[PDB]
Structures are given as C-alpha cells and as structure tokens.
Design a protein around this ligand. Structure first.
Ligand code: HEM
Ligand SMILES: CCOC(=O)CCCCCCn1ccnc1
Ligand SMILES: [Cl-]
Ligand SMILES: [Cl-]
Ligand SMILES: [Mg+2]
Ligand SMILES: [Mg+2]
Length: 431
C-alpha cells in the first residue's frame, strides 16, 4: 500500500516466483473456459503438463461456424517443439496451422504460404523475403521512429488527465502504420484494415466477434480490398509489397486472386495482431518489475537486444502453431499416427526448465535466450521477426525518452484466444 511510484499503479510482483502447478484434472485445453483463466493458472497448468504429461491428447475447440473435427497431440516441452519445427517433412504445415479444420470457403482467404510445405512455400516466401531482411528493415528506422514518437507525444497531448489506453494509443497503431505502408495501403484505410484483422484473429472473444457470418464478411471484405489494390498496382506499379506480389511468378505463373488475397491477408494480420501484444505485455511486465524498467532505462542501447527478446519470450504472443503428421512417429513413448494433428505450445516451451533454469524470472539481460516466440526455427521461421524486434525496441525507447514512468493502472483486459496472447486494453498513466 506504500510502494514507490505513481499512486494508481498496479501491484508489483516478486520476480522469479513460480506459479503454483495446477492439478491435471483441472486442465482442459479443449475448452474456451480454460483460456479465460488467469495467466498464472494457465502458466501453472502448462507446468503440470511438462512434468506429468509432456505429450497429451486434447479435443479441438469448436468456435461457432468453424469445424473442430479431430483432436490434437499437445507438445509442451521445448525439445519436442524444436524437433517438430525442424522436421517439416514429418510435421507438415498443410492443411492448417490452427487446430481447427481448413475448408474451401476459408482457403480463399487463408491459403497462404503458412499452410504450405516446400518447395511451393519457399517460392512464395522468396517474393517478399528481401523486404523483411535485417538490412532492408533497418532502412525504415526513420519511419518507425517518426510514428512511434508522434504516437507517444499524442498520448500526452490528447489526455490532460494523464490517463490513456496503451493498446489503442500506441501498441496497436504503431505496427499497423508500418505494415500498411510497406504493403502500399493508403492511410485513410489503415483503421479499416485494423478492424478486419482484429476480428480475424479475435474470433471467439465476444468483444471482437462470435458470429461466423461476421467473420466471413470481414474476410471477404479484406480479400476484396486486396484484390482491388492488386488490380491497381498491376496497371500502375508502386514500390510496395502489393506490387511485388502481383508482378511475381511462381513456377512460371502469376499468383491467382486467391493466392494474392491470402498473401496480403497473411502479411497484414501477422503485422497487426502480434507486435502490439509484445509491446503491451512488455509494459505490463515493466510495471510489475520496476527494477527491470530501471536497468533498461539507464542503459537502453546496451540492453535493448536482450530486453526485446526477453519481452517476446515472456509474452509468447503466438501461443501455439499446429502441424499434421505425414508419417507415424513416436515421441516420449507416445505413438502418433500419420494424419494426426500436433500442436506446438510456444508458451510452454518458453517456460521449460529443461532449457531455461530460471524461467519464471523476467530478466532483460537474459543471455543466451533461445526462446521459441518466433517459433522453433526452420522453414517457417517468422518472416516478420526483424521488423517486430525493431518496432518493439523503438516503442520502448520513445516511452523511455518522453514518459519514462509510464505504468499500467489496471490489470489488462485479456483477449479470449487459444492462439494469440492478446491484450485488448491496458490503462496506463505517467507523471
Ligand atoms: C512479436 C511479434 C511476432 C511474433 C511473436 C511472431 C511469431 C511467429 C511465429 C511463432 C510464427 C510461426 C513460425 C513457425 O511455424 O516455425 C510466425 C510466422 C510468420 N510470421 Fe510472425 N510473429 C510476429 C510478428 C510478425 C510480423 C511483424 C510479421 C510481418 C508481416 C509476421 C509475419 C509472419 C509470417 C508471414 C509468417 C509465416 C512465415 C512462413 O510460413 O514462412 N510476423 N510468426
Ligand atoms: C487464421 C486466420 O489468420 C490467418 O490465417 C492469417 C494470419 C496468420 C498469422 C499467424 C500468427 N502470426 C502472427 C504474426 N506472425 C504469425
Ligand atoms: Cl517450474
Ligand atoms: Cl527484478
Ligand atoms: Mg481514454
Ligand atoms: Mg504509401
């Protein structure tokens, strides 16, 4: 009740404290109710699974209008998630990378390279890979700085009472601007794009959408938007990713309408529904662990590489990805069959004591940090990892410089999702 800092700040936590493990009878990964439990309970549940049932089978959650279908084998240990990620010939990304079943209706919009194996996957990725390389992403530092600086200044100018929502006022709009400008989308449409991607990756949370007809209308609307922009760029090139997409050939053929729409959707969804959560979880963590804030603030450039990676490990913005077996395998005495679904729990790998001796410590100097927040490595390693790391670093530097004592004042409103570790709103203040 008499803590350092601003009076309405949330409670701090003792760094390093492991959450209690949860009795296995209380764990139901196949119920959306489990995904509504407190993150301490979730974290303690995956701790139980790592200890007691490191590979275990679960029914698939059926969100309204999706097809659940067959259940899945959950890999909760780091070493199994890594192995699966590095064996794509066994653990295929086709037909889907979420646990539910693909359909033709969905594949119009969600049939991108993320649900394909090589060689076609790599031929698609090579259309855009150069734009996401470290040395190319570095050359847009000025754009990231301009927008992040302006957003933080606007939080100050727009809120005389010194209260704001970090998500809507910084964490959301920064990555949105950057990916949309890369794509070649005009500013006037960025908020439309953001509403569409919020629904696409928020489905099942009543605050976002629970009517499948709304999900499909949004998907059709963003697909139509992509097609129309692509059509413009076919006739008049711009130096943007949409133009690259429409100019490319794979195996001697231009991409179809479905392929262009799916590629465009993949890139904007992934740009808009990930980094914002790393930033927001990171501010939550700094609020809980002020010693970590202080050490980063007093050596920002020196600690930034490791600090950003620790924020990603801590947040695990992508909770899991799915694979499908192409052959029978056995792991940990559990035999899994060709055709079975396998879920890779990055959130759990990133707390595995076998790989991190002190996994419950939020340590901005952590080195090494072999976290799987961008996946286990290999063919599908996050295309956006360099971009995301730069966005995160700049956002925190701009906060440090202009409102160093920014702190959460309420616990987050958490997205109801099995797939994305999302924060919908995070009230903050500053002096
Ligand atoms: C902190 C932010 C992010 C996290 C934690 C994240 C995480 C991931 C993960 C876990 C995967 C799957 C990797 C695998 O299967 O091995 C992935 C793939 C991907 N990510 Fe990200 N991502 C982030 C930001 C971004 C950004 C900014 C973009 C830019 C558009 C992006 C685009 C993609 C794409 C296109 C793929 C599919 C790559 C492929 O199939 O080859 N992501 N990401
Ligand atoms: C299911 C509907 O959305 C999609 O299929 C398209 C987006 C998939 C993105 C996967 C998650 N992610 C975010 C950032 N990097 C990876
Ligand atoms: Cl533990
Ligand atoms: Cl600490
Ligand atoms: Mg407000
Ligand atoms: Mg532009």
């Amino acid at each position: 009740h008499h803590h350092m800092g601003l009076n309405t700040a949330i409670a701090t936590r003792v760094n390093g404290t492991p959450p209690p493990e949860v009795p296995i009878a209380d764990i139901e990964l196949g119920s959306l109710d489990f995904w509504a439990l407190d993150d301490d309970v979730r974290d303690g549940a995956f701790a139980t699974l790592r200890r007691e049932a490191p590979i275990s089978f679960w029914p698939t959650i059926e969100l309204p209008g999706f097809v659940a279908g067959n259940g899945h084998w959950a890999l909760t240990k780091y070493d199994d998630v890594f192995y699966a990620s590095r064996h794509p010939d066994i653990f295929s990304s086709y037909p889907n990378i979420t646990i539910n079943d693909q359909t033709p209706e969905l594949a119009e919009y969600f049939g991108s390279m993320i649900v394909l194996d090589d060689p076609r996957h790599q031929r698609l990725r090579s259309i855009v890979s150069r734009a996401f390389t470290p040395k190319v992403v570095a050359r847009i530092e000025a754009a990231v700085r301009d927008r992040a600086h302006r957003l933080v200044s606007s939080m100050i100018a727009n809120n005389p009472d010194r209260q704001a929502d970090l998500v809507s006022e910084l964490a959301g709009p920064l990555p949105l601007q950057i990916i949309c400008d890369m794509m070649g989308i005009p500013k006037a449409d960025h908020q439309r794009i953001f509403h569409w991607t919020n629904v696409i990756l928020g489905f099942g949370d009543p605050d976002l959408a629970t009517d499948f007809d709304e999900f499909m209308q949004v998907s059709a609307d963003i697909g139509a938007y992509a097609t129309a922009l692509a059509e413009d760029r076919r006739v008049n090139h711009h130096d943007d990713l949409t133009s690259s997409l429409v100019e490319a050939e794979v195996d001697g053929e231009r991409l179809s309408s479905r392929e262009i729409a799916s590629f465009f959707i993949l890139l904007v969804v992934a740009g808009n529904e990930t980094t914002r959560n790393a930033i927001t979880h990171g501010v939550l963590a700094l609020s809980r662990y002020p010693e970590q804030r202080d050490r980063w603030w007093s050596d920002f450039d020196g600690l930034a590489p490791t600090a950003v990676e620790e924020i990603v490990r801590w947040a695990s913005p992508v909770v899991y990805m799915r694979r499908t077996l192409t052959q029978d395998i056995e792991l940990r005495g559990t035999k899994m069959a060709a055709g079975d679904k396998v879920s890779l729990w990055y959130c759990s790998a990133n707390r595995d004591e076998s790989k991190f001796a002190d996994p419950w410590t939020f340590d901005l100097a952590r080195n090494p940090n072999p976290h799987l927040g961008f996946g286990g490595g290999g063919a599908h390693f996050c295309l956006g990892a360099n971009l995301a790391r730069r966005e995160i670093r700049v956002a925190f530097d701009e906060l440090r410089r202009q409102m160093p004592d920014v702190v959460a004042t309420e616990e987050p409103a958490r997205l109801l999702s099995q797939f994305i570790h999302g924060i919908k709103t995070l009230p903050v203040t500053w002096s």
